[PDB]
Amino acid sequence: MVLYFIGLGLYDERDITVKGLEIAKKCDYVFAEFYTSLMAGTTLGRIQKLIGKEIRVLSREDVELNFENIVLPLAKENDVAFLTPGDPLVATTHAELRIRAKRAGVESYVIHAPSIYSAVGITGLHIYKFGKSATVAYPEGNWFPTSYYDVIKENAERGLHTLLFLDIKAEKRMYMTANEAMELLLKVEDMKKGGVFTDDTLVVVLARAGSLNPTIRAGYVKDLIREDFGDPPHILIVPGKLHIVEAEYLVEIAGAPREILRVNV
């Protein structure tokens, strides 16, 4: 009688931790969701093969409206696992599911896995220097999300880096590219005119972290906005004030213009 939230990691089925795999293999029932992120280097079949169990995939509605009607009932008399991409609790609302579990009288455990939130380290930007993060959401109808612009502004004023999660609509198989995020940010700049995001802004793009050959690129928006960063998922970062070694890494590893080596203290 238990429920395990088990993260599957960044890119493929092997990004699960040994702990997560060993526990999943012993569970009676295994559910999963793939709407919170995209694992571009695997399939349901490969994951099932690895854990040696059939996996029931749930939709956002199954989870958000009927988790306690679909999964919890089984966890009352069996060992159940719920798999998610990356870490199950990062930039999702899954933490609240632990409350539902408690109320169902079901004990729950969390098995972590590599998350994009810490994977940002491969960009060379010091992780402690990141400030508030935000998500660039697709405009819908007449609704045009813009709060993420204010987040960048706030962090930038403090000299902090801004991590921008990009939108996803898994049911339509829509994954926002860093290019699309940049276009939206330029449009928000045209509206608010804070001088926060322009053609001259330095940005960093990380695509398919977790793969052996992820795309890591840094440069000015005017130069990267039309660049091909490969298949999704992508994340966009707007760095704040750069330390010398951060700039050095961006130039040497992410191909940034050599002129950024010249930090403006």
Ligand X SMILES: Nc1ncnc2c1ncn2[C@@H]1O[C@H](CSCC[C@H](N)C(=O)O)[C@@H](O)[C@H]1O
Provide the binding-site residues for a copy of itself, judged by CB under 8 A. Answer: 7, 9-10, 12-19, 21-22, 50, 86-96, 98-99, 102, 109-110, 112-115, 117-119, 121-122, 124, 126-135, 154, 158, 160, 165, 209-210, 212-213, 245-246, 248-249, 252-253
Q: Does residue 88 contact residue 6 with C-beta atoms inside 8 Å?
A: yes
Q: Alpha helix locations (H) across 106-170?
A: 116-119, 147-158
Nearest to 235 by CA among 82, 112, 113, 125: 125
Residue 234 annotated as lining a ligand binding site: yes
Residue 21 annotated as lining a ligand binding site: no
Closest distance to ligand X from the beta carbon of 234 (Å):
6
Closest distance to a copy of itself from the beta carbon of 226 (Å):
27
Residue 30 annotated as lining a ligand binding site: no
* Interacting residues of 238 by C-beta distance below 8 A, sequence separation 6+: 152, 155, 156, 161, 162, 164, 197, 201, 202, 203, 204
Q: Say whether residue 16 binds ligand X (CB under 6 A).
A: no
Q: Does residue 30 contact residue 24 with C-beta atoms inside 8 Å?
A: yes
Q: Say whether residue 165 binds Na ion (CB under 5 A).
A: no
Task: Count other C-beta atoms under 10 Å from residue 77's C-beta.
Answer: 9
- How far is residue 160's CA from residue 214's CA, in Å, rounded to a whole number? 24
Closest distance to ligand X from the beta carbon of 250 (Å):
17
Q: Say whether residue 151 binds ligand X (CB under 6 A).
A: no
Residue 90 annotated as lining a ligand binding site: yes
Q: Say whether residue 130 binds Na ion (CB under 5 A).
A: yes
Closest distance to a copy of itself from the beta carbon of 76 (Å):
18
Q: Say whether residue 11 binds ligand X (CB under 6 A).
A: yes
Single-letter code of the amino acid located at 229: F
Residues that bind Na ion (CB under 5 A): 130
